[PDB]
Amino acid sequence: WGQPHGGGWGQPHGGGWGQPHGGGWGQPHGGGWGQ
Incomplete structure (x- = not known):
């Protein structure tokens, strides 16, 4: 289990x-961003 x-x-x-x-x-949606 893993209850609190x-x-x-x-x-x-x-x-x-x-x-x-x-x-x-922040991850790219189509291809990179500002790397």
Whole structure:
């Protein structure tokens, strides 16, 4: 198992954390960005 002992573990507090909400963030969508 992996249930919390006091209050959650690695789950978000106000909606995700460092993950994309629509698809991505800084990563390239078609081909690179400003590298």
